[PDB]
Design a binder for this molecule. Structure first.
Ligand SMILES: CC(=O)Nc1nc2cc(F)ccc2s1
Length: 342
């Protein structure tokens, strides 16, 4: 009937209660997030005298374990910052409370998804896209520190939170899906819309898959809609093929899952499988962003910094991130030196 003396529920989740005090310290305000791991509560730390976000992990061995891998990666990253000038969310401390591992983060505001909804999925300026773009890019440069070399492995608008509701500073959150570069253990990784070509094709992946996820994240922020909104891996891949073409032959010949989406004709070349979709590479990104037509749906026409010039710098950068070959796909360091950030 009852679980953990009344503090948990069916799902192994702590029952949050308006007003409750923990350890004569954290005045628990309200529930602000929810997922597989457990629940995120808003709370007032009375000692440091501030708001804090607390990530309450479910009372289960499986979630606690993945949560202790998170604590490991956060604490690691945190000691290569100390200033906090690389846009990763800060872990302040962590304690056990009623058999729940709670991770205490700095309090942040809306995530980039809530902002899209705040536009009605019509998106934000290129000037604001650029500021997420620079920050997000500096975070991949940070992660890519060889002793870190951490793959976030599930970047999306709603894993990117604004520090303040009146500033454009951003922070990446949630490192429970993350792991350090290693031999290939896992394959069903990344949220589907932002799933790399290499993942979908079952090839080996590196930090570059985070760059793909940025490329599609960056475009959806300006249009207001996913670039590649797949209902299923087949339909995900087909939408990428619309925009970028068939993947290079030397990549498909390597892929263990090449035949889930394409078929090797007798001659060596590859073509799609009939299942709707524009012919391969005919849904040109130059058009989706409205480079020569006043931006996404003509809504940016006239606005400063939204010229044809401004838009092509944006395009070419987006094309290097959505590069099919994981080794030539642009890296954080040279991405920061692209003209788009002049
Ligand atoms: C969402 C997750 O995995 N961790 C965190 N999620 C949040 C959400 C907030 F509004 C503030 C801080 C954090 S930390």
């Amino acid at each position: 009937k009852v679980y953990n003396d009344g503090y948990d529920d069916d799902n192994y989740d702590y029952i949050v209660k308006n007003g409750e005090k923990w350890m004569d310290r954290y005045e628990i305000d309200s529930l602000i997030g929810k997922g597989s791991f457990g629940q995120v509560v808003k709370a007032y730390d009375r000692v440091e005298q501030e708001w804090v976000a607390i990530k309450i992990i479910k009372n289960k061995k499986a979630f606690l374990n993945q949560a202790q891998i998170e604590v490991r990666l956060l604490e690691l990253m945190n000691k290569h910052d100390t200033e906090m000038k690389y846009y990763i969310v800060h872990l302040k401390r962590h304690f056990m409370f009623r058999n729940h591992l709670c991770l205490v983060f700095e309090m942040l505001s809306y995530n980039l998804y809530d902002l899209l909804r705040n536009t009605n999925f019509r998106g934000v300026s290129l000037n604001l896209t650029r500021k997420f773009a620079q920050q997000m890019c500096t975070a991949l440069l940070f992660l890519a520190t060889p002793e870190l070399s951490i793959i976030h492995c599930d970047l999306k608008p709603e894993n990117i939170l604004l520090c303040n509701p009146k500033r454009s500073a951003i922070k990446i959150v949630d490192f429970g899906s993350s792991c350090q570069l290693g031999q290939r253990i896992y394959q069903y990784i990344q949220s589907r819309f932002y799933r790399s070509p290499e993942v979908l094709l079952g090839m080996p992946y590196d930090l570059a898959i985070d760059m793909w996820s940025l490329g599609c994240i960056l475009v959806e922020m300006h249009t207001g809609e996913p670039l590649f909104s797949g209902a299923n891996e087949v339909d995900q891949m087909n939408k990428i093929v619309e925009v970028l073409g068939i993947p290079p032959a030397h990549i498909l010949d390597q892929a263990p899952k090449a035949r889930k989406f394409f078929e090797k004709l007798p001659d060596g070349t590859w073509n799609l499988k009939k299942t709707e979709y524009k012919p391969p590479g005919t849904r040109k990104l130059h058009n989706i962003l409205g480079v020569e037509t006043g931006g996404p749906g003509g809504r940016r026409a006239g606005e400063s910094g939204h010229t044809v010039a401004d838009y092509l710098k944006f395009k070419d950068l987006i094309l290097r991130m959505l590069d099919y070959d994981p080794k030539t796909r642009i890296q954080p360091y040279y991405a920061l030196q692209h003209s788009f950030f002049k």
